[PDB]
Design a protein around this nucleic acid. Structure first.
Ligand SMILES: Nc1ccn([C@H]2C[C@H](O)[C@@H](COP(=O)(O)OP(=O)(O)OP(=O)(O)O)O2)c(=O)n1
Ligand SMILES: [Mg+2]
Ligand SMILES: [Mg+2]
Lengths: 983, 363, 358
DNA sequence: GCGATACGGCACTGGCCCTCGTCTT
DNA sequence: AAGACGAGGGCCAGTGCCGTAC
C-alpha cells in the first residue's frame, strides 16, 4: 500500500507520472530477468505529525535552512573579501596575549581581537608541544599578533590547561575563522573545548581548494613528478594541497619563502626567541597568503558549489568534538604497556634464534645451512699503526701461604692498571660496531654510541626480511628467497629447462640439505609445482606462481599457518604464535604515535556545566576534558573528511591491542551520545540512479529492486544475500559488491573471492562467471557487437555509429558512465562540480573509475551534508541540548544528554527520512520505498562504538572498568515526538 | 630432566643424588649451592626492586619465625598483619599501603612426618573495599609480568582465576615444568576478617583514610615461592629439533645470573705483570658485578673445556687477559648468548658490563 | 635512655610498652623490628657481605637449614657451613684454604615459663691449614675490628679482647662499649678439625685439602658476628635541645627526603614525583613527605627527619617552578642550602661515594 | 579497461657528505 | 712535511609492502 512500497507522506499530492509504457518495459524486463515472486511483507507504517515545512518543496526547505544557517558566515566571508589591507607592522610586539596593529602598526595590548571574521595560523614549538607559542591574525580592519606565556624562562609543567589562544568574545553573528588546515588552528582555541557552544565556525582554504581544483593521489604522484596521450593538460590547471602551491595556483604571485631551518619542528624554544621577529614575519606571510587564497577561492567555490547545503554542511563538519577523561591516559598507559610486552616477547624469541644460529660460523659450516648462506659471515680484526720499535718479537714477550703485610700492593696493581689503561686510547680512533661477530649480526645490533642501546641483537622483525628466512620452513620445501618478490603465495603441458655448472668465484650453494629436508618433511622444477610445493636448484624464476607481486613477509596467512603447510622449525607452535603476536600489535605499531601524541585539553571545575556537577559523578577526583578531531573539511574525493587518526581508527576487535580507541571517547556525566549508520547509502544510491534513469518508480530495475527489499533485522540484506551463497558474511561480500560496481575485474574478483572463501579456483571461477552476468554485455576490427544487428558487412561506411558505449541487462553502469561522459559539471543531485583536473574538457581522461566512484561517493557526501544541516535545523528549533557533531562518512553521532536522547534519535530518523526523500525528489518521484526510509540501528550510549554490545582486548573487562551498556533502536523511539513534552 | 648433573657439577644445588622433584617441591632438599643461593639472591633482590622500592606506600616488615606462646610459622602474612597499626602511623593512615618481606617459611609434610622449609616473598596489600578487586587484578597482571620476564619462553608462566569456599576472589600463578604446571605464587583477597579478629575491642585503630572517609581495610595478599621460582628459571634457562648441532648451556637472564663475568689468564705462561688481573678484579667488584677468578688452575686444557664450564655456570661474558693486551690494552671477550670472540678495552669493558646489566634491566 | 623512645616513634623498633627495655632488646625476644631498623640491618648486612667479597681468593655464600635434619632449632651457624665443605671442595678444586660465609636467623633460649629468642647473625667459616691458622685468625681479627671501625663514629667505642682454652687454642672476642656496659658483638674462634672430624668419620680421606703438594686436614676458623647487636651499637653510636641520630651515610636507611612548601598544588606533586623517580633510579632511598598531607611546621619536620637519621632534607617551593632552585638542608651541619634540582642526584651520589674510604 | 576515497607505518636503498685513513709529492 | 684518492658511517628522500577506516 501502495505501488510496491510507499508511506503516508505530505511531500506532494501530485504525483504520477505513471509512464505505463516504461513500467511495461520494466515489468517485462523484471519478468525475463526474472523476478516476479514477491514476498508480500508490508513493513509497519508510521503515523506521526511531521515538523513544519516552509515550502514549496523540500528542496527550498533544505535550501532556506542551509542559507539561514550559513548566512552570517557568508556575510563575514564577504567582509573578508572586500577587506582593504593595512600594511604589516615594522616590528612585532614581544608581549604576552594579543597585540593589535592599527595605525602605522602601533602596538596596542589586547586580550581578545574583537572581529567579525579573520584569517588565522597558529604556531607551536614541537620540541615541547603541543602548546601554542605564536599566532598571527589579520582582520578587515587591522592586524593582530598573539604570543603565548612562553616569554619568561621557567620550568613549566604541561598538563594541557586552558593555555591555547583565546578568540571568542563573551556575551555577558558572531564569528568566522578561515585558514589553511584551519582545524589545527581551531585545536589551539581556548573556548572551543567547552562542552556547550559554539557560534564560531571555521572555513578551510585547503578543503575549499580540494572542492574547486582538487586532484587524486595518483595525480599527485605524477604531478610532483613533473620536475597517456593528453594526460598532461590538467597539469597547470590544478595543484597539490600545499599552501605555497595552492597560492602559486590561485594567486600566482611570487613564490612564498618557507622556513629553511624548520625551527618550529627541528629547534627548541631557545633558538625560537633568538629568531622571534623572523618567525613572526613568516607566520604573517602565511596568514597573508592564506587570506589571498581564500579571497580568490570563495567566489570560485560559490560558483562550483552553488547549493548552500554544501556550505553549511562544511561549516558544521568542521566543528567536531570528542569528550574524554582520565580513562584516556589510563588507556594510553595500558595499551603502550601491552604493546611493549608483546614486542619484548617477540624480539626476545627472535633474538634468541639470531643468537643460537650465530654459532655455526666455526668452521665454515654455515654453507651447509640451507637458510643462512646468502649473507656476509665476515670476520674482521682492524686495526693498528706501528709506533713501537724495534726488531724484537713482542708476541711471545702451587706455593701455600697467607701474607697481607703488603696492604697497599692493591693500590700498586690499581695504579699499574690505570697507567696501562691510559696509554692505549690513542691507538684506535672511532669506536666501530663489533667486528668479531658476522655482518648479518652486526646489522642486527644497535650501535654502541647510541643513546637507546639495548643489549644483544635488537631491531628484530617482523616485518624484517632476514629473520623469517632465518627460522621458517617453506611451503613443503627447503628455502625461502627474495629478489623481486619473496616466497610466492597469495597476493596443454607447460614446461621449462634446467642447468648446473661450475666457474667461480661466487658464493657456494647447497642443494642437498633441501632435498633431505623435503624427505624429512614427507617422512610423516617438475613435478609437484602446481598444487604441491618444492624448490629447484638455481635459476631463479617463477615456474608456477599465481600472484603477480609477492609478499615479504607472510603476515596474514594464519589459516595457511594453522593447517600444516606452512610451518616453522624450530619449532612447534612458535610460528602461529609469532604470527598471532604480529597480528595483535599490527595496529598499535602503525598508530601509537598518532594516539599517544593525540593532545587533549582539560577544562577545570571553573569552566564546566554546573548541571553536570549536580549529576552524581565527579568522579572521585577525576579529570574531564576533550579534543577536537582536527579534521580537514574536504579531502579528495568527494570532499570527504580527512583526519590522520580518528578516520582510520580500528574497530572493537578482541585481537588488536589499541582496539578500544574508538570506545574511549566517553560522554560526560548527564550527557550521552546518539548516532546512526546509514544502511546502506552508496548501494541504494546507484540503485536510484538506475531506476530513475530507466523509469519513474524505484523498483523498475534488476539491481535496484533487490537493494530496497532486504531488512537487516532478523532478515537478509543484498550484501547478506550475496554473503549467503555461500558466500562469506558480511564485510567481505560488501567489498565484493562495492568492488563490482567500480570495476569487477575478472582476476581481481577471482583472487578476492578465492581469498575470502578459501576453496579451489575452478569452482570459484564458475561462481564469478555466474556473478559476472550483471555487467554483461557491453558495446574495421572490433568487439563483435555494435548498433547494427550483425557485425559482418562489406565496405560499409559507419564511422558515425562508433560513438555509443553501454552495458546491458542487470546493472546500470550506463548512467554512471553517462555522468562520466558530460564535459560539463557532472553533478547529480546536488550538485557540485569537482576538479578542473578531472573535468573531461581538456582531460583525456582515462580516469573513469575515479569518476564513477566520484559520482556515487558524491551522492554519499551530499547525503552526509544533508544529514548535517537537517540535524542542525531541528536541534536549535527544539529544546535538544548538545548539538556537537562527530561524523564518519556513512555514520554520524551527536553528543546529546541523557534526558534528550530519544528525541535526538527521533531527530536522526526524521533527518534520514527527509534526506532519502530528497534523493528521491531530485530524480522523481518524491515517493520512496519502505525499507529505506528510516534508520534501522540507532546507537545511544556513553562511549561511541560499532555494535551496542562491546568487548575488548587491553582492558579485558569493559564493564569491569567504569562503563555502561548500549541500546538497539529501533521502533520504540517512534513514540517520543519532537515536542519537548513527552512520556 | 637431565640438567641436574649440570646443577651438581656446577653447584647451583647439592651434589646429593636424592634430589627428586618431590624433594625439591617440598623444600626438604639439603640446600642450594653457592651459585644457586646467589641466583635466588638476585631473584629476591629483583623482587624487592620491582615491588618495594619503585612503588611508594610499601614498606619492609620484620616478622618473627615463631610465636611467644614445637612448630614454626607456615606463612609470613600474619606476622606482617601484626604490624598493621604502626605502619599505619608511619603512613598517616593513608591506605592503600603494603608491607613486604622475604623470609623462609616452615611447612609440615607427611612423606608417604618431616618438615620442609622454603624461602617465600610476601606482600600484604591493605586496600579499601571499594577498590579491592581492582588492586587484585593490578597485582595479578604486574606479578605475572614480573615472572614472565627473565624467561626465555614466557608462555610457561600462567595465571588461574579461582574463588574461595565462601566466595572470595583470588588468583594463582603457575610455571609449566616438564612434568606439568606447578604453583609458584598465590594472590588472595581477604575480606578484613583476620584484622577484625585480631582487634575485637577497639576497631577504631583499624580505620584507614580512603579519602574523604575512614573505612575498614580489606587485606590483599600475594605470596611467592622463590625456591620453586629459582628452580623454574633454572629449568627455563636450559634448552629442540633439527638444530643439527647442540651445546650444553643454560640461558639465565643477565640480571639474576649468579656470576656475571669470568676473568682468566691467557698466554700463558706470562710473568710477572699479571697483577693487572687483580686490578680489573677489584675494579669490577667495586661496581657490583659478579666476577669468577680464573687464576689458580689445573687446566691447562682445551679452551672449549672452560668455555663449556662457564656456559654451564650461565656466565654472561668471558674476559681473557693476554700478554698482547698487556702490551697494547685490548683484552678478549666471549659472550654466552652468542659464542664469538671479541676485542675490547679495559675501562670500556667495565662500562660495557655496567651498561649491559643496566640496559638488560630495561626493555 | 631517651634513645629507645625515638626508635619507637620513628619506627626503628616494633611497638612495645613493657618489652622495650634494654634487657629485652639484648635478648633475642621481640617485638621484632621497624622498617627503618629493617633497612638499616639490610644495609649493614650488605656492607658486611661487601667487606668479605673483596676478600681474596674466593668465599662461597651458602644457606643452612633452621630445624633439625633428623627431626631442634639451630643455635650457631657452623654446622650448616660444615655440611657444605666437602662439596665446595670441588668448586675450589681442593687448591687452597677457603671460607664459607652466610647470614641467618639463629635462635637461643631466653629465660614463669621460659621462651625463645631470635638473632640475625653473620658467620664466616674459614678453613685454613693448622700451620697458618693463627696468623689468619689475627688477620680476620684486624679486618673485622677495622670493619666495625669504618662505620663507627668512634673507634674507641669498639674493642678487641684476647682469650684461649683447652678446647680452642686461641680465640678473640669483639666487644662494644655502650657505655652502660661493654657487650659481646662478635666471636672469632680457632676450632680444630675435631668439629669436622666428628661428622665425617670416616674415612676422612675426603676432608684433607691440597696445600702445596701436601694433603692436610684443615683447622676451622669460626667467625660469628651479630648484626642486631651491631645495629643497636651504631644506633647508640649515632645518638647525639637537639635529638639527631647521625648514622653513617652508607649505613643510613633513608638518606634523603623531599616535601613541598607552597600550598597543595598538583604541579608541586608532579615535580616531587619526578625527583622521586630520578633519585630512586640511581639507587638512593628517598622518603616521600610531599603526600603530605598538611605540611604543618618546618622545625618539627626537621626534628622528625633528624630522628630518622636522614642525611639531607629537600624542600620544593614554588620558586622551583621558575628557577629550578631547591632548598637543601644537611643533617650533620644543619646548613640550610639552596641548589638547582638538576644537580641534586650527582651531589647525593658523590656524597655517598665520598664516604667510601678506609 | 579498471576498486574507490583516504590515512599512516617500517624495511630497504642509492646518494650526498663529512671524517679518518693512507698512499703520494 | 703537504696534498690527493679511497673506505666507512650518518642524514636524507624515494620506493615497495603492509596496516586501518569508510
Ligand atoms: N571498501 C569500501 C567500503 C565502503 N565504501 C563506501 C561505500 C559505502 O556505501 C560507503 C559506506 O560504507 P559502509 O561500510 O557503511 O557500507 P554499507 O552502507 O553498504 O554498510 P551498512 O549497510 O552496514 O551501512 O563507503 C567503499 O566504497 N568501499
Ligand atoms: Mg553504512
Ligand atoms: Mg559506512
Amino acid at each position: 500500500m501502495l505501488s510496491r512500497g510507499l508511506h503516508e507522506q505530505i511531500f506532494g499530492q501530485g504525483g504520477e507520472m505513471p509512464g505505463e509504457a516504461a513500467v511495461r518495459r520494466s515489468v517485462e524486463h523484471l519478468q525475463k530477468h526474472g523476478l516476479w515472486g514477491q514476498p508480500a511483507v508490508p513493513l509497519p507504517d508510521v503515523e506521526l505529525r511531521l515538523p513544519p515545512l516552509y515550502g514549496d518543496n523540500l528542496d527550498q526547505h533544505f535550501r532556506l535552512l542551509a542559507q539561514k544557517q550559513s548566512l552570517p558566515y557568508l556575510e563575514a566571508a564577504n567582509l573578508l573579501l572586500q577587506a582593504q589591507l593595512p600594511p604589516k607592522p615594522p616590528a612585532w610586539a614581544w608581549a604576552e596575549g594579543w597585540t593589535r596593529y592599527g595605525p602605522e602598526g602601533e602596538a596596542v595590548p589586547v586580550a581578545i581581537p574583537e572581529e567579525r571574521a579573520l584569517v588565522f595560523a597558529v604556531a607551536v614549538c614541537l620540541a615541547e608541544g603541543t602548546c601554542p607559542t605564536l599566532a598571527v591574525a589579520i582582520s578587515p580592519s587591522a592586524w593582530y599578533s598573539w604570543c603565548s606565556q612562553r616569554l619568561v624562562e621557567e620550568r613549566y609543567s604541561w598538563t594541557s590547561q586552558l593555555s591555547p589562544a583565546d578568540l571568542i568574545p563573551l556575551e555577558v553573528q558572531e564569528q568566522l575563522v578561515v585558514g589553511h588546515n584551519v582545524s589545527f588552528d581551531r585545536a589551539h582555541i581556548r573556548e572551543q573545548y567547552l562542552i556547550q557552544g559554539s557560534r564560531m565556525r571555521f572555513l578551510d582554504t585547503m578543503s575549499m581548494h580540494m572542492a574547486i581544483s582538487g586532484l587524486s593521489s595518483f595525480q599527485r604522484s605524477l604531478w610532483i613528478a613533473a620536475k597517456a596521450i593528453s594526460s598532461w593538460d590538467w597539469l597547470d590547471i590544478s595543484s597539490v594541497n600545499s599552501l605555497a602551491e595552492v597560492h602559486r595556483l590561485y594567486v600566482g604571485g611570487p613564490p612564498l619563502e618557507k622556513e629553511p631551518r624548520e625551527l618550529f619542528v627541528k629547534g627548541t624554544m631557545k633558538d625560537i626567541r633568538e629568531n622571534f621577529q623572523d618567525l613572526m614575519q613568516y607566520c604573517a606571510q602565511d596568514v597573508w597568503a592564506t587570506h589571498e587564497v581564500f579571497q580568490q577561492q570563495l567566489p570560485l567555490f560559490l560558483e562550483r558549489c552553488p547549493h548552500p547545503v554544501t556550505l553549511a554542511g562544511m561549516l558544521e563538519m568542521g566543528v567536531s568534538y570528542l569528550p574524554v577523561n582520565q580513562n584516556w591516559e589510563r588507556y594510553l598507559a595500558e595499551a603502550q604497556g601491552t604493546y611493549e610486552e608483546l614486542q619484548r616477547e617477540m624480539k626476545k624469541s627472535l633474538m634468541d634464534l639470531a643468537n643460537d644460529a650465530c654459532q655455526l660460523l666455526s668452521g665454515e659450516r654455515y654453507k651447509e645451512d640451507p637458510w643462512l648462506w646468502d649473507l656476509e659471515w665476515d670476520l674482521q680484526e682492524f686495526k693498528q699503526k706501528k709506533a713501537k720499535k724495534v726488531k724484537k718479537e713482542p708476541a711471545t714477550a702451587l706455593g701455600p701461604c697467607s701474607e697481607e703485610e703488603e696492604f697497599q700492593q692493591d693500590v700498586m696493581a690499581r695504579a699499574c692498571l690505570q697507567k696501562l689503561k691510559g696509554t692505549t686510547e690513542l691507538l684506535p680512533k672511532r669506536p666501530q660496531h663489533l667486528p668479531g661477530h658476522p655482518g648479518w649480526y652486526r646489522k642486527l645490533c644497535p650501535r654502541l654510541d647510541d643513546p637507546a642501546w639495548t643489549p644483544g641483537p635488537s631491531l628484530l622483525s617482523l616485518q624484517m626480511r632476514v629473520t623469517p628466512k632465518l627460522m621458517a620452513l617453506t611451503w613443503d620445501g627447503f628455502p625461502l628467497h627474495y629478489s623481486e618478490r619473496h616466497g610466492w603465495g597469495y597476493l596443454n603441458l607447460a614446461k621449462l629447462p634446467t642447468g648446473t655448472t661450475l666457474e667461480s668465484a661466487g658464493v657456494v650453494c647447497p642443494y642437498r640439505a633441501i632435498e633431505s629436508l623435503y624427505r624429512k618433511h614427507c617422512l610423516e622444477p617438475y613435478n609437484d609445482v602446481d598444487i604441491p610445493g618444492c624448490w629447484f636448484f638455481k635459476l631463479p624464476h617463477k615456474d608456477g606462481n599465481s600472484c603477480n607481486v609477492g609478499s615479504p613477509f607472510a603476515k596474514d596467512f594464519l589459516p595457511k599457518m594453522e593447517d600444516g603447510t606452512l610451518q616453522a622449525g624450530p619449532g612447534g607452535a612458535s610460528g602461529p604464535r609469532a604470527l598471532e603476536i604480529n597480528k595483535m600489535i599490527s595496529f598499535w605499531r602503525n598508530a601509537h604515535k598518532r594516539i599517544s601524541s593525540q593532545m587533549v585539553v582539560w577544562l577545570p571545575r571553573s569552566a564546566l556545566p554546573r548541571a553536570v556537577i549536580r549529576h552524581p559523578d565527579y568522579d572521585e577526583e577525576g579529570l574531564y576534558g576533550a579534543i577536537l578531531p582536527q579534521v580537514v573539511t574536504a579531502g579528495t574525493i568527494t570532499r570527504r573528511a580527512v583526519e590522520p587518526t580518528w578516520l582510520t581508527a580500528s574497530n572493537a576487535r578482541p585481537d588488536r591491542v589499541g582496539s578500544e580507541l574508538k570506545a574511549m571517547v566517553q560522554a560526560p556525566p548527564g550527557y550521552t551520545l546518539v548516532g546512526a549508520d546509514v544502511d546502506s547509502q552508496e548501494l541504494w544510491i546507484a540503485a536510484v540512479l538506475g531506476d530513475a534513469h530507466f523509469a519513474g518508480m524505484h523498483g523498475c530495475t534488476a539491481f535496484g529492486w533487490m537493494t530496497l527489499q532486504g531488512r537487516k533485522s532478523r532478515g537478509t540484506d543484498l550484501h547478506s544475500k550475496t554473503a549467503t551463497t555461500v558466500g562469506i558474511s558480511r564485510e567481505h561480500a560488501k567489498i565484493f559488491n562495492y568492488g563490482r560496481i567500480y570495476g569487477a575485474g575478472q582476476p581481481f574478483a577471482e583472487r578476492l573471492l578465492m581469498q575470502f572463501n578459501h576453496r579451489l579456483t575452478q569452482q570459484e571461477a564458475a561462481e564469478k562467471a555466474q556473478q559476472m552476468y550483471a555487467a554483461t554485455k557491453g558495446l574495421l576490427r572490433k568487439v563483435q557487437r555494435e548498433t547494427a544487428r550483425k557485425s559482418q558487412w562489406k565496405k560499409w561506411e559507419v564511422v558515425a555509429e562508433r560513438a555509443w558505449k553501454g552495458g546491458t541487462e542487470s546493472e546500470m553502469f550506463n548512467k554512471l558512465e553517462s555522468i562520466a561522459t558530460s564535459d560539463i559539471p557532472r553533478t547529480p543531485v546536488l550538485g557540485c562540480c569537482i576538479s578542473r583536473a578531472l573535468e573531461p574538457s581538456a582531460v583525456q581522461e582515462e580516469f573513469m573509475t575515479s569518476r564513477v566512484n566520484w559520482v556515487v561517493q558524491s551522492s554519499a557526501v551530499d547525503y552526509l551534508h544533508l544529514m548535517l544541516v537537517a540535524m542542525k535545523w531541528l536541534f536549535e528549533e527544539f529544546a535538544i541540548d548538545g548539538r556537537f557533531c562527530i561524523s564518519i562518512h556513512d555514520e554520524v553521532r551527536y553528543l546529546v544528554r541523557e534526558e534528550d536522547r530519544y528525541r535526538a534519535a527521533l531527530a536522526l530518523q526524521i533527518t534520514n527520512l527527509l534526506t532519502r526523500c530528497m534523493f528521491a525528489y531530485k530524480l522523481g518521484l518524491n515517493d520512496l520505498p519502505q525499507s529505506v526510509a528510516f534508520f534501522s540501528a540507532v546507537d545511544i550510549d556513553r562511549c561511541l562504538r560499532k555494535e551496542v554490545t562491546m568487548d575488548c582486548k587491553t582492558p579485558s573487562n569493559p564493564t569491569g572498568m567504569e562503563r555502561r551498556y548500549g541500546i538497539p533502536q529501533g521502533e520504540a523511539l517512534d513514540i517520543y515526538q519532537i515536542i519537548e513534552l513527552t512520556k | 630432566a637431565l640438567l641436574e648433573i649440570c646443577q651438581r657439577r656446577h653447584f647451583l644445588s647439592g651434589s646429593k643424588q636424592q634430589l627428586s622433584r618431590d624433594s625439591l617441591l617440598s623444600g626438604c632438599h639439603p640446600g642450594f649451592g653457592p651459585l644457586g643461593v646467589e641466583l635466588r639472591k638476585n631473584l629476591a633482590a629483583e623482587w624487592w626492586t620491582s615491588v618495594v622500592v619503585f612503588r611508594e606506600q610499601v614498606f619492609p616488615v620484620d616478622a618473627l619465625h615463631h610465636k611467644p606462646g614445637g612448630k614454626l610459622r607456615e606463612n609470613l602474612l600474619h606476622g606482617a598483619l601484626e604490624h598493621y597499626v604502626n605502619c599505619l602511623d608511619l603512613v598517616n593512615k593513608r591506605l592503600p599501603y603494603g608491607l613486604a618481606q622475604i623470609g623462609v617459611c616452615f611447612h609440615p609434610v607427611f612423606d608417604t612426618k618431616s618438615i620442609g622449609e622454603k624461602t617465600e616473598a610476601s606482600l600484604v596489600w591493605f586496600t579499601p573495599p571499594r577498590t579491592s578487586n581492582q588492586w587484585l587484578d593490578f597485582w595479578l597482571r604486574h606479578r605475572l609480568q614480573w615472572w614472565r620476564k627473565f624467561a626465555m619462553s614466557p608462555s610457561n608462566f600462567s595465571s588461574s582465576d579461582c574463588q574461595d569456599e565462601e566466595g572470595r576472589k583470588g588468583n594463582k600463578l603457575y610455571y609449566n615444568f616438564p612434568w606439568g604446571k606447578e604453583l609458584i605464587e598465590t594472590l588472595w583477597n581477604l575480606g578484613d576478617h583476620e584484622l577484625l579478629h585480631m582487634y575485637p575491642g577497639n576497631v577504631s585503630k583499624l580505620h584507614g583514610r580512603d579519602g574523604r572517609k575512614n573505612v575498614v581495610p580489606c587485606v590483599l595478599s600475594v605470596n611467592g615461592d622463590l625456591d620453586r621460582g629459582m628452580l623454574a628459571y633454572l629449568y627455563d634457562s636450559f634448552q629442540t629439533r633439527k638444530k643439527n648441532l647442540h651445546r650444553k648451556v643454560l640461558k639465565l637472564h643477565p640480571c639474576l645470573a649468579p656470576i656475571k663475568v669470568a676473568l682468566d689468564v691467557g698466554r700463558g705462561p706470562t710473568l710477572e705483570l699479571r697483577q693487572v688481573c687483580q686490578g680489573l678484579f677489584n675494579e669490577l667488584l667495586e661496581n657490583g658485578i659478579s666476577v669468577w677468578p680464573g687464576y689458580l688452575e689445573t687446566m691447562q686444557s682445551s679452551l672449549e673445556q672452560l668455555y663449556s664450564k662457564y656456559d654451564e655456570m650461565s656466565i654472561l661474558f668471558t674476559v681473557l687477559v693476554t700478554e698482547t693486551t698487556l702490551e697494547n690494552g685490548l683484552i678478549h671477550l666471549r659472550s654466552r648468548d652468542t659464542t664469538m670472540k671479541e676485542m675490547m678495552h679495559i675501562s670500556k669493558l667495565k662500562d660495557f658490563l655496567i651498561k649491559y646489566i643496566s640496559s638488560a634491566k630495561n626493555v
